[PDB]
Amino acid sequence: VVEAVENAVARVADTISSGPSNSQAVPALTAVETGHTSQVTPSDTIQTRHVRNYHSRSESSIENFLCRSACVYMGEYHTTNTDTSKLFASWTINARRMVQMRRKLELFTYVRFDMEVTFVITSKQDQGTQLGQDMPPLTHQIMYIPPGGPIPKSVTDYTWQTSTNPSIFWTEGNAPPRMSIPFISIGNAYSNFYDGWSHFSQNGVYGYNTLNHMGQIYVRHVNGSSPLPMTSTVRMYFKPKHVKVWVPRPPRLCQYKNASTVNFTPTNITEKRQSINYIPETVKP
Amino acid sequence: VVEAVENAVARVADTISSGPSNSQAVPALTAVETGHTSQVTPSDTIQTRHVRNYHSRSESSIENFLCRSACVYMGEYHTTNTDTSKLFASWTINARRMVQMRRKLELFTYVRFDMEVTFVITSKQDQGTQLGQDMPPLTHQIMYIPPGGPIPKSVTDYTWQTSTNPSIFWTEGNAPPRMSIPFISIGNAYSNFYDGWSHFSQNGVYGYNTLNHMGQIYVRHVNGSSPLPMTSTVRMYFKPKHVKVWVPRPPRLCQYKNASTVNFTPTNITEKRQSINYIPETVKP
Amino acid sequence: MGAQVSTQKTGAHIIHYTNINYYKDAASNSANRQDFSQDPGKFTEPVKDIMVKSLPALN
Amino acid sequence: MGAQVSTQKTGAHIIHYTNINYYKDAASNSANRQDFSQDPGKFTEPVKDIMVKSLPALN
Amino acid sequence: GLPVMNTPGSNQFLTSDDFQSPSAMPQFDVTPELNIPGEVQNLMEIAEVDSVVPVNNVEGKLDTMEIYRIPVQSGNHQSSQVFGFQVQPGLDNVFKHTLLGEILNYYAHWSGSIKLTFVFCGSAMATGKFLLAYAPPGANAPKSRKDAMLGTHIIWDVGLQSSCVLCIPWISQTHYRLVQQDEYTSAGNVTCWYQTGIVVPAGTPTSCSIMCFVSACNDFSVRLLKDTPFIEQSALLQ
Amino acid sequence: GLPVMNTPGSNQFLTSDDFQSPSAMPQFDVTPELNIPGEVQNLMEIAEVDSVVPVNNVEGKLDTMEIYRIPVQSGNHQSSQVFGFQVQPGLDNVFKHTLLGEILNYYAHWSGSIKLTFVFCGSAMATGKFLLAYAPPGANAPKSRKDAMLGTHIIWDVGLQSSCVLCIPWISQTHYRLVQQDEYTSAGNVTCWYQTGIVVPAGTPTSCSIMCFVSACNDFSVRLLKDTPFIEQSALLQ
Amino acid sequence: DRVRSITLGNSTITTQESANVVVAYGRWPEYLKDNEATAEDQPTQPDVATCRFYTLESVTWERDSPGWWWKFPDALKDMGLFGQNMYYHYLGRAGYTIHVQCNASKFHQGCLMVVCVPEAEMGCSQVDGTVNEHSLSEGETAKKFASTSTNGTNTVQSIVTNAGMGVGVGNLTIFPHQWINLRTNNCATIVMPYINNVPMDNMFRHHNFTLMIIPFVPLDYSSDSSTYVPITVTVAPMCAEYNGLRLATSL
Amino acid sequence: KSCPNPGEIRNGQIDVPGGILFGATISFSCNTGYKLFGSTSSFCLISGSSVQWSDPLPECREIYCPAPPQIDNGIIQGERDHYGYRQSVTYACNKGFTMIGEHSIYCTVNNDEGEWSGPPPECRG
């Protein structure tokens, strides 16, 4: 049984012709005091020719805009060390440590979507004096710790039994480990912003950290120790699918400071030119 | 649901019979002054027999001619060096550094097509005194920088996060990395030639470089440094699919000089023979 | 076998592709890159009374 | 399931193949190696008045 | 089993591909949707909204609200040019930080026409007429109102309806234009001159201000996603 | 999942294969087509166009326009042969650089017949008749007009209609012929002789010129794509 | 059959030994239609002031003269109200009708090639160098090929046999062309549509095409035939639009 | 102000990289096969009652190969003077002698000086 799906293409509006005009219709004079954005197509101000316009606003929809993978965390962990807490990587989940996808997601106040998560794990042999060994392929475990579960204390913990937490074993040399994630939230939309506190006495922690608690991730080398040290770096890539977004906001201007807060330093609105009348002369023999 | 597609085969024209003739029809006498190419089938000049001709002009259509992969750039990059700009390859995109596909594409003035791009990346261990090591498989990143994006300054840049630029990670030992590319142009056809300038004062840069700005490509080793140096060479192969071509031109005669210009040295039209009457005698005891 | 044949993205001036879903969860599907809808008057003209583009904005 | 069964290239003197497109973009298809068309009179005979091959080219 | 054969491009991770992928939380039960107000369904809905344009971005006024307002006064100032700026909605410092500009800078090509709406912000008794002209590229910016008069202009009479819309049409040869504009895909320049001047009675201020709001017409479109140059970090946790 | 099994030829890169492949720019919106004049749809449309043939490619005349024109004069020159050349449209220096030859040299086999059109380029009062003969291979080139007379010839009378077409037919045993011709797939040789001579009145020049245009008939075809030997480099950036 | 008349604007051309009329690729000049257009504003279409026969100064066909080339437009830029609209407007579109006129007696002999070349991008004399603009076009004064390889900085490599583009000068028969064989005809006409890869294009920046006149068989005559044989070129735009008006360019 | 038109050096070339206005220089060259007798460049200077050119136009005069070297036991078919560029000299041997080598030599130009091709033939007894 085959089903035919209908997909309509949304072109942009053509240019209707026009001629001279001498009337009391002023399509130009308006009043911005009303919070209303003038709809003056060129055919209202000048004489235009009929132009069938085939262009499309497809690559600017929200799904085409956001559904592209982007890195959101990089972390390193060693096969052997003398710290036992550097033998595995760990981090709380948020899209907020890399400025690119942060700023991208933060043109909207509430974003509701599924995701496609990918991991790029790349090991290197640590620089030393006595290199040279035959180590077999490394395999890695990526465990997701929801908020509440027990978190590991070493790479030989019991928690890595991953009885109910989902976790991925991947043996280096194959295609990256990818999986898909539903809308795992308790609100009705991930709230990028939040003007409020956690405690009802109007104090506590301010803003985003209050709302979103999505747990942690813990990555480790399953193999075991290593004759000579090696260090692996894991990068995590988020790609939002089935994207819905609400209440847009002006794009960020000032540079980000930390992943907790929206604190900033004041910056200029834009960069300078010589005068207010300055247009450079570029037609010159 | 299965759909039957009809594919017609285009044979070449048969030879109709003929006999003696004594008439005022001169199918031979013509006048080339009119810019018109005589249509004189042999059956007009001599007595021919009816010949059903099954031959086909299929392997000479433009799609069968051009749709074959060909290398268009070769570049080397090292895992370790003391230059930090030789650790990654980089180049602006044009089909114009290799003479074969250049000359092939340049029988036409405007070529509009999609492409299928393939990369053949081959590493070698650099010759030295102390060889011998256990390095794991190398993996490479190939980033495409459209015209405007930020370009890397090292192999540890931020730009390699490839948030929106498309880029390929490939772990050596598999099938080559291939992808497909639409007609990414702003004109209505890629213009192999251009008799004009960039500035309106009739100066600037002359010819092709003006028109086509398609961005750059940057290749790197993701792994990291290497105990002992190694050097990788990347070759890029273009194969035009869905090919449309306009306004043919005489094939190039003189050899190419550079990828910027059509400059040349004058060459002879063709090579010499002893006389104008010279045909070699090849039936000899 | 539970397929759906929709249309590809071609420009204007053999175009049908086939989709089958393999997983038991809609959070495993592809992305909906072929929905193009708009309603700018929500942000562009968020006013109680209409304004007709050829009459004075006041008066 | 959205297929199309066209004819192979055999000489003259069990020949049908099957195609299915998997990607959402026509820039991902195969090549159209089975269109053979011609119009040489565009370059061969680009003249205003016709010339009939059995009459003098002039006169 | 079935004989398969792997083509090139296997086992790679292309950032902008959409395949299916196993759910790591099977039979999850998502939270019911909510008809929250104000849902965006395209980005050319954020770029059709007016945005105050920092025209007066001379030095010394870049962190002041004064950057937003064009000075205009009464007297015989017909020889002086009020303002003027290139049309480069993604590259000119005047535009690159508007809503139009910040939305463009995520894309690489842009086509369509633009709407610049001017708001006279002086007394209720000041009166003047202004000339607002757009000059398609090909020749240096006009330096007198007799040249700006020859362009694509409008004459805005200041009255009850305060504001006036100069709609920069789309004149180009290429269907599109780069966002990182060069002098091949240049777009022109707009310039503003007094047509009769400002006249005020006694007891009102003489120095008034205009303001300029940029938005995209209903035929605008952008394409070829890219990264924006405006955000940048130097380590994680930022 | 499905049990597959990989056959030989897996994970190879064959230059001339056509598979599908992921688009690296999904949902791209290409520029609308344009009905630009003069679209090519086959290469045997570039090889059916006349092309001046450098017959007189003796040494000392190879970088001169003189290479293109055959000398012809008035007097008792009936013993002399005007011109003669092998039929090797892809290998003979006379042909290998025409449009026919440069299009063939991208292929390895060629079948069909050829049209050689001769243009008398002398006075409007000079008169002569010429014999143009083609000799299918099997015997040395004719050395006298009594032997050329026996071939496949035409007698061209010079008059108002200046030019005359000798259509070299396709006589061969193999359906095709190599482009890099040997003496198995040889094709013959054409030769030209005076039939009556040139006669001019007083006050016109005596030394005239012919010219020869080669094109392919409507049953020509080429096959088995190869590389052309005419272009070559010694490093990248060329 | 050999008589012909071409009436464009307020100009007429009569001819009595014409061979035929090459219409470039079977295609006639036409206006930009509504679905292939890209510019929003209304175009100027003057139609009789600009689509007429402009005659460029004439060149003397000598016994040893390699050839000549002109570049269109930038040849008609100082011709009437074509060369004025062409100044005041950013974008321009037009096809042409080129009539080349060279007459001799019945005691003269020769053969010219008259060929229109789209995008005739040319090659400097020093291989590692760049042309001027003067070296591509002098306006209505023709540039001249050379019977040997030329030297000098910034000047096109104008040996005839390569035609300045690096190709064989006998293969130019792929372009719309005619011959002038002083024994049969005395004029060549080529009707040239707007061939370019964008709908409209600027007129000062891009030399849309190149007209090359190359004598393959040279002049000759005897005792006292007329020594002076000139060639005259007439070009007439057709279906000429302009778009994007502003103040006039300057060079 | 504009100088008068430079002109046209036949068998040569004029390079005007910056126009012909006041204070503009132009350069002169000669094609392959000719020597440039005259000035190399010309400026737009003030001349009495106008602006005109610094130096007049030069001449490209043909480069000649020297007389062809005669050979013993041989002959030249109609030997001539004025052996310009690309022109040929044909040899022959005498009765009882056999011809060896290039039987005819063609004049070229190298380093801006006329030069024949390889050595003339030999006549063996």
DSSP string, B138-185: -EEEEEEE-TTS---SSTT-SGGG-SSS-EEEEETTSSPPEEEE----
Chains A and F touch (3+ CB pairs under 8 A): yes
| Interchain CB distance below 8 Å, A245 and E222 | no
> Can you read off the two tokens belonging to residue A35?
């919070």
CA distance F67 to chain H (A): 13
Cis bond upstream, residue G73 (ω within 30): yes
Strand-strand pairing, D3-7 and B2-4: parallel
Same-domain pairing of H53 and H83: no
User: Which of A61, A67, A243 is nearest residue C36 as measured by Cβ atoms?
Assistant: A61
E38 closest CA partner among F222, C26, C44, A76:
C44
Domain that holds residue B142: 1-285
Beta bridge partners of residue A248, listed in sequence order? A108
Q: Which of residues 17-46 of D touch F (CB under 8 A)?
A: 21-25, 27-31, 33, 36-40, 42-44
Number of neighbours of residue F15 by Cβ within 10 angstroms: 11
> Can you read off the two tokens belonging to residue B123?
């590493």
From chain G, pick out residues whose CB is under 8 angstroms from the CB of D41.
26
| Interchain CB distance below 8 Å, F119 and G181 | yes
Q: How far is Cα B17 from Cα G116, in angstroms, rounded to an integer? A: 40
Torsion sign across C-alpha atoms F220, F225, F229, F230: positive
The sheet carrying G177-181 orders its strands as G143-144, G68-72, G209-217, G111-118, G177-181
From chain G, pick out residues whose CB is under 8 angstroms from the CB of F60.
none
Q: How far is Cα E186 from Cα F76, in angstroms, rounded to an integer? A: 71
Quick check: H103 contacting F, CB < 8 Å? no
Beta bridge partners of residue B220, listed in sequence order? B88, B141
Domain that holds residue C29: 1-59
Q: How far is Cα F83 from Cα B101, in angstroms, rounded to an integer? A: 37
| Interchain CB distance below 8 Å, G109 and F205 | yes
Give me the phi and psi of G174, to 5 degrees please: -75, -20
User: Which of F33, F59, F93 is nearest residue B188 as measured by Cβ atoms?
Assistant: F33
Strand-strand pairing, H41-47 and H34-37: unpaired
Say how far residue G88 (Cα) sits from the centre of its chain: 23
| Interchain CB distance below 8 Å, B258 and G128 | yes
Question: Which H helix or E strand runs over A66?
Answer: helix A62-66
| Interchain CB distance below 8 Å, F98 and G174 | no
Domains identified in chain E, total number? 1
Residues of F near H (CB-CB distance < 8 A)? 59-61, 63-64
Quick check: F97 and F234 in contact, CB under 8 A?
A: no
- Which of B1, B9, B54 to probe by mutation at the D interface, max D CB count within 10 Å? B9
Report the chain D residue with the minimal C-alpha distance to residue G17: D58
User: Which of A15, A54, A283 is nearest residue G40 as measured by Cβ atoms?
Assistant: A15
Quick check: D39 contacting B, CB < 8 Å? no
Quick check: E4 contacting F, CB < 8 Å? yes
Vertex E234 angle, CA E231 and E238, to 5°: 70
Q: How far is Cα G42 from Cα G241, in angstroms, rounded to an integer? A: 10
| Interchain CB distance below 8 Å, E231 and A118 | no
Quick check: A120 contacting B, CB < 8 Å? yes
Per DSSP, the residues of D1-57 read --EEEEE--------EEEE---SSBGGGS---TT-----GGGTS---SS---SSS-S
Q: Is D48 exposed, middle or buried (0-12, 13-18, 19+ CB in 10 A)?
A: middle
| Interchain CB distance below 8 Å, B253 and G202 | no
From chain A, pick out residues whose CB is under 8 angstroms from the CB of F29.
55-56, 58-59
Give me the phi and psi of F58, to 5 degrees please: -75, 170
- Which of C53, C55, C58 to probe by mutation at the A interface, max A CB count within 10 Å? C53
CA distance E197 to chain G (A): 25
Residues of A near G (CB-CB distance < 8 A)? 15, 42, 46-52, 54, 283, 285
Question: Which H helix or E strand runs over A232?
Answer: strand A230-248
CA distance C44 to chain F (A): 26
Q: Which of H62, H77, H100 is the last residue of a domain?
A: H62
Quick check: F32 contacting A, CB < 8 Å? yes
Domain that holds residue H9: 1-62
Chains that touch B (3 or more CB pairs under 8 A): A, D, E, F, G
F27 closest CA partner among A114, B184, A113, B115:
B184
Report the chain F residue with the minimal C-alpha distance to residue A60: F27
Quick check: B58 contacting D, CB < 8 Å? yes
> Can you read off the two tokens belonging to residue G98?
């080129």
Domains identified in chain H, total number? 2
CA distance A150 to chain C (A): 27
Q: How far is Cα F199 from Cα F74, in angstroms, rounded to an integer? A: 6
Buried b / exposed e across B203-236, counting CB within 10 Å, b at 16+?
bbebbbbbbbbebbbbbbbbbbebbbebbbebbb
Q: How far is Cα F168 from Cα B41, in angstroms, rounded to an integer? A: 9
Say how far residue C18 (Cα) sits from the centre of its chain: 20
Say how far residue A25 (Cα) sits from the centre of its chain: 47
> Can you read off the two tokens belonging to residue A92?
């709380």
Quick check: F33 contacting A, CB < 8 Å? no
Experimental method, per PDB record: cryo-EM
CA distance D16 to chain C (A): 16
Q: How far is Cα A115 from Cα G15, in angstroms, rounded to an integer? A: 76
CA distance B201 to chain A (A): 6
Report the chain A residue with the minimal C-alpha distance to residue B172: A173
Residue that is written with structure tokens 């937490």 in the block:
A165
Q: How far is Cα C9 from Cα E18, in angstroms, rounded to an integer? A: 15
From chain A, pick out residues whose CB is under 8 angstroms from the CB of G34.
49-52
Same-domain pairing of H56 and H16: yes
| Interchain CB distance below 8 Å, D23 and C17 | yes
Quick check: A143 and A234 in contact, CB under 8 A?
A: no
| Interchain CB distance below 8 Å, B180 and D28 | yes
User: Which of D42, D48, D59 is nearest residue G25 as measured by Cβ atoms?
Assistant: D42
Q: How far is Cα B32 from Cα G179, in angstroms, rounded to an integer? A: 7
Quick check: F112 and F189 in contact, CB under 8 A?
A: no
Q: How far is Cα G23 from Cα G191, in angstroms, rounded to an integer? A: 5
User: Which of F4, F22, F28 is nearest residue E4 as measured by Cβ atoms?
Assistant: F4
| Interchain CB distance below 8 Å, H15 and G144 | no
Quick check: F14 contacting E, CB < 8 Å? no
Quick check: A180 and C28 in contact, CB under 8 A?
A: yes
> Can you read off the two tokens belonging to residue B71?
């290398």
| Interchain CB distance below 8 Å, G43 and A15 | no
Coil, strand or helix: which one is B99?
helix
Q: Which of H62, H86, H102 is the last residue of a domain?
A: H62
Domains identified in chain B, total number? 1
Alpha helices in chain F (DSSP H): 99-104, 145-148
From chain F, pick out residues whose CB is under 8 angstroms from the CB of C11.
29-33
- Which of G32, G33, G42, G250 to probe by mutation at the A interface, max A CB count within 10 Å? G42
Report the chain E residue with the minimal C-alpha distance to residue A27: E165
The amino acid that residue H101 corresponds to is: G
Coil, strand or helix: which one is A70?
strand
User: Which of A27, A242, A248 is nearest residue C54 as measured by Cβ atoms?
Assistant: A27
Say how far residue H49 (Cα) sits from the centre of its chain: 38
User: Which of G147, G150, G153 is nearest residue H27 as measured by Cβ atoms?
Assistant: G153
| Interchain CB distance below 8 Å, G249 and E151 | no
Domains identified in chain C, total number? 1
From chain G, pick out residues whose CB is under 8 angstroms from the CB of A54.
35
Domain that holds residue F48: 1-238
| Interchain CB distance below 8 Å, G199 and E173 | yes
Number of neighbours of residue F139 by Cβ within 10 angstroms: 12
| Interchain CB distance below 8 Å, E48 and C27 | no
Q: How far is Cα B244 from Cα D37, in angstroms, rounded to an integer? A: 12
